[PDB]
Symmetry: D2
Subunit: 430 residues, 4 copies
């Protein structure tokens, strides 16, 4: 293994206890599936933010029988204490806060041997997937990949369309219990957290520009508005844009507010959102950040190349002075601000996300000599069955004291579903 400081493992372990209590879903799967060991002999290479919450996931997969080796999926997201807690325990992990792109891909390469290869992939952003497929040989050897975020799943569909998807892929992001909770309610808390730990800026009164209005944009807009920001939103999709208008947000172009906005938040999963056209027009000390998976939503390379002064205010906060004499504050060098300047999403919402990930791995690994998840030419992307999506939500109601009504036989019949569900048809959007 390799982590910043192994001494921090003790502190890491103390917080994993509190993290475990806040993740009743992951812990119940540990009770339920621990004994039967559904991932007996699984060899999972994981590429996903090395947080305290991922620490609980990792320890679940090992509890369910899996061998596992881990790397972060971002150079700033690793929490040095969670990594050290995993390392002290003996699960091979290669992650620390502040990796170079070279060290990053080094860490990811360490997880693809020494089990000896992996036979399963667990990924957040598609870097591992693309790498295993395009740079190794692991196309007779890997039985499935579980993909956690929208940009990675986009990646997966570009491969299916092209004819290059060689292994079955589970689309975890698009579980209702991931997509409409993690992406939405997670960012609604973890965006402002990163902004505030970085800059301690007052949100109340400010004009914020939120680019994109999908699940991430929805959450980020609701958070900023909640603290008294006036939020304006940009969009390319007429539907998402109209959702934003009907929720009371102005929908305009970045150019329309670039000179007046105090805060710029990128949420699209698309590159070149905030560019060389925008930077020189920004007000003094306009804070610029991104919460989408890749930093290239912001032209940071341009900012660095064209700024006249750069000051590290503190780690993951760079204050640039432009040729016009005004300042730009960039957060986490454009990397995911919630994970880079704070601790990401709280444990409780990641319990939903990671439950789907555990269920996904069980689905693909246990059914490996089944033909239910075909290899090679005919490999395709799948979702978790809706029954399992419901199971995950049901596992998280108790902690909150939410009480569920039970359908009578006549009611289930009238609605056209089973008494124990699934309750909605597969096209339902929640």
């Amino acid at each position: 293994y390799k982590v910043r400081d192994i001494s921090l493992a003790e502190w890491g372990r103390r917080e994993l206890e509190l993290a475990e209590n806040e993740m009743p879903g992951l812990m119940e799967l540990r009770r339920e599936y621990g004994p039967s060991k559904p991932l007996k002999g699984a060899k999972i290479a994981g590429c996903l933010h090395m947080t305290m919450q991922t620490a609980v996931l990792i320890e679940t997969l090992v509890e369910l029988g899996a061998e596992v080796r881990w790397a972060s999926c971002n150079i700033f997201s690793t929490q040095d204490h969670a990594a050290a807690a995993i390392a002290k325990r003996g699960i091979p992990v290669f992650a620390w806060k502040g990796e170079t792109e070279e060290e990053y891909m080094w860490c990811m390469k360490q997880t693809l041997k020494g089990f000896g290869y992996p036979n399963m992939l667990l990924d957040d952003g598609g870097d591992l997937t693309n790498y295993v497929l395009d740079e190794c040989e692991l196309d007779g050897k890997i039985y499935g990949v579980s993909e956690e975020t929208t940009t990675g799943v986009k990646n997966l569909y570009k491969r299916l369309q092209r004819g290059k998807l060689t292994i079955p892929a589970m689309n975890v992001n698009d579980s209702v219990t991931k997509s409409k909770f993690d992406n939405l309610y997670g960012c609604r808390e973890s965006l402002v957290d990163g902004i505030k730990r970085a800059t301690d800026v007052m949100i109340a009164g400010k004009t914020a520009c939120v680019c994109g209005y999908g699940d991430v944009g929805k959450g980020c807009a609701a958070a900023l508005r909640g603290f008294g920001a006036r939020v304006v939103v940009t969009e390319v999709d007429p539907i998402n844009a109209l959702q934003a208008a009907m929720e009371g947000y102005q929908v305009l172009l970045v150019e329309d507010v670039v000179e007046e906005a105090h805060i710029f938040v990128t949420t699209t999963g698309n590159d070149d959102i905030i560019t060389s056209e925008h930077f020189p027009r920004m007000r003094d000390d306009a804070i610029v950040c991104n919460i989408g998976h890749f930093d290239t939503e912001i032209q940071v390379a341009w900012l660095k190349a064209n700024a006249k002064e750069r000051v590290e205010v503190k780690p993951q906060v760079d204050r640039y002075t432009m040729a016009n004499g005004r300042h730009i504050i960039l957060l986490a060098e454009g990397r995911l601000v919630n994970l880079g300047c704070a601790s990401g999403h709280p444990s409780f919402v990641m319990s939903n996300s990671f439950c789907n990930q555990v269920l996904a791995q069980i689905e693909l690994w246990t059914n490996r000599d089944t033909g239910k998840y075909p290899r090679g030419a005919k490999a395709q992307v799948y979702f978790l069955p809706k029954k399992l999506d419901e199971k995950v939500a049901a596992l998280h109601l108790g902690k909150l004291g939410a009480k569920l009504t039970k359908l009578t036989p006549k009611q289930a019949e009238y609605i056209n579903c089973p008494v124990d569900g699934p309750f909605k048809p597969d096209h339902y959007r929640y």
Copy 2:
């Protein structure tokens, strides 16, 4: 025709001038498609709440070339000046506020005769499923219908029950489950039209009250939001753990009706299911508890039991009945359990109804124009194509002054869609 009072045509013509300006989408289809007349030949049997909004829909269909005959799909939903205006214009309408069950039935049968030729309709446009049921189960139109478009969740639920049972003979387009309907009309429509119905009915203060919203689907989401916006403390009931986790995560107590039945001042039923508010709840309610339904059918509330077992019933005003129970305490029932927004107010505002009714126009066009293309065999349920979903939304941005960002080619390639969309994959939940 058959309306209450034809001298209300003048007043309805005046409001339709305001309705037209609030429905840019429908008026923009009137301009785009009227010259070519794509529903020429079309003989539409219509069964949808006869409001001012539907009047702009009915005149769009006739501008597009269709012959049309209409009836309201609820006994108390007609706006009498709406029907009077359409009736003067020469369109056959059978609809008044306060139809008995007998009279309601007669009106529907009128819409299935009196076309040109041995003019039996060749098309259906449905809200709730009743017309579809009557035509397929009881009329003879066996060889004569090329499609049905279905407006609501309850009506669509029946279509899927029929298809499942091998009894769907005519192709059906699911309009409710267009994104620009379900995530707009069901949600934002109810967010404004629910409290409108309650207040016009009772003038009651929302702020400070305890309100039990039963169900937390698209309609339940909207109602809870509306009540909470006015300072109600809203508690939610759900059978679905996913919807329940959403409500919990938005700040609402999720409990059983029985947990709040003694303290709630307001009960709203939004389920699309029967026997939510029953004989076991009614005698437990606090004095002057307001009970209403905004689901399609009234049998979410056991109103027959209420009527059978009340000691006293008083009409405060039409559609507001105050019952005295055996216990001496009172229950205020709205619209006899009928959709309260349409029953005690005017239904959703025009602007949102423009989203829904655009979908209905493009669905009728899609079904009818492919009536000799063999694309919808006379039998499945279909969705409007996402391209047309987006179009609907795009037509409504201008009125609000919302501006849409345009993707570059690099950007569209990177996110895997055309520069002009569809922008999202078919399973996206918005």
Copy 3:
């Protein structure tokens, strides 16, 4: 008496049974003070919107022993079934919906005669100041009035102008500035009754629209909140930097009417000032812009200019006038600039009006019982004592099921108040 239609007494009696159950505070004063009759001798001249809520106020005063004569303080605010019920009960009322300016004037003069003795009133109860102005400037009652209680901000503003000018002769109790009035009625009342007036008037969608709220006092705060709750993008105008910073800090753009006059779909004037929406604004407005006022007098809007300079005026329905301007575009004016909540709807709900009208009962009791104690010389403006402010609030908690913590002696000593309060210093702003 003089009402529109006395056969509406029956319908009004039925609604007053619901109003009574929604006004626990007024009904609790009826029980507490009725036995002792503390307003015995009292001859109250009343000038306050003749609604169902005021009917419960008028019957409380008469239960308390007072003789009372009433007139509405606005031409379109009367609820005709409210007046019909009070008129049947034997109380002299002069009030109908749609009084001319002549007729309005006659009704007020009726309330100043016909008491017992050479029965000139000995008390005034005012909303807006007009009765106070008429009695003091133009009637003879010079030796005969022991007090006036003033309901609203505009009326109270006049009382302070008079006191300043050395023209206040009768003691005045400022009821508007009780906390349980100003921070409740003005705020929460308008939060529900504004959109009620707009929607009953126009059925217009709020969601998605741009609304200009002019003024951000207690009424402005409520209106903006209401519009925003439904997905309006609200912009605010203010002359006061403190109120402006509040609106900015709550997420609202603070700008000049001229900055949004061309794009706003909805203008609300809440200032208590004249010439907010003027001849310079009207010709600039978008087609079918909705203009209304919820301030006391209509002259916040230059309606005379509008009427003088419109090419066309059309009555969509009573109190909804659609003007065609020289430019060909339309303006929708509500209630001819009169208070839109009372003009196009029913005013604030009963429950909040119970807070305000309790204050009015305890103010009349305070003034009248000290009518031979020399406490209010016949001349200053006064406030209800904070003890009675708190009492009003305390009377309304039960209905909502709110529970109040009780201070220990140690705790009351530590925060420097009695165990039973007053709990706050006289300058506390809540």
Copy 4:
């Protein structure tokens, strides 16, 4: 001086730059009053949280001519970098994070000499005021004190009532621009910040108990609800309690929710809110914190004395194990959580607060041989004049782009104020 680490001054200075930009009010007073030196020879002993924001205040008072010596007012609130930045500059400061009660009062004693005494007091919480008055001789020597928070001002009024107020006191907390901004909007951002930096807990879904519903409680409740918490509120005041009910919060007793609440937040400024009666009933890992000025709102001494295990999770987060085997997480040992576990209120809102503080010091110090602020027997508590309250708000509108409307002479006359204000009568509550 004495601070943790003088080396941190550099980092401290970099952030004071960003803090200055975010405090346009303080910086404008520095421009306006810098030249004339209104505090020429002032000798200000300051007892107020030694944050980055206080650093900007301190440097303003020195810019305006004052000598100044500083101590924190809480043992956990000092930001070691801001203190070091002040110390490097040469302003005597005695503060570090993690002072003992002995070291704390040592630091406060250092500020009352070496100018040689002070002649002015600047205080947050009343510890300095009480000390200077009850333990020194500085009753011929001190010309005025400026008091920043509600509990200190309470203290001041207990002294006035008793007859022990010997020097004029400026009540800064009760400036509208302090009370209704700092207390309200400040806590609305800085509460969740402290909770999240401490525990990274998910707010969405949780039941939070907020004790008190004054300005602090209002903000804290709005913040928690904003992230999807279900917030219940406790109160002793019927008015504040009814405000909470009408905003949609349950109002109940701590005993009513003690077993189910995930988070307990104390906001009263009263002791013994969360006690030995509550601790043993709390759910596993219930988070307990206080945001009021003194930690004695929570019985921490009891918790420590009766818990079976205590673990420092990390600095300012103690996890206690109770005799029942369940856990309590206590934040900042019960001290102000926003300052103790985070960075307090953002700079922009503290600019309002500290502008009143600068204006206050100028008012008392410049008018020292005036008799406007009488010494000894007849000393009384004063507010800032309303003109100056408005000035402070006006200084903060620009940064936000808020545009103020200018009254015409007729409008100012009609409203009964000057064109340049003050705009409201002194009883106005905003």
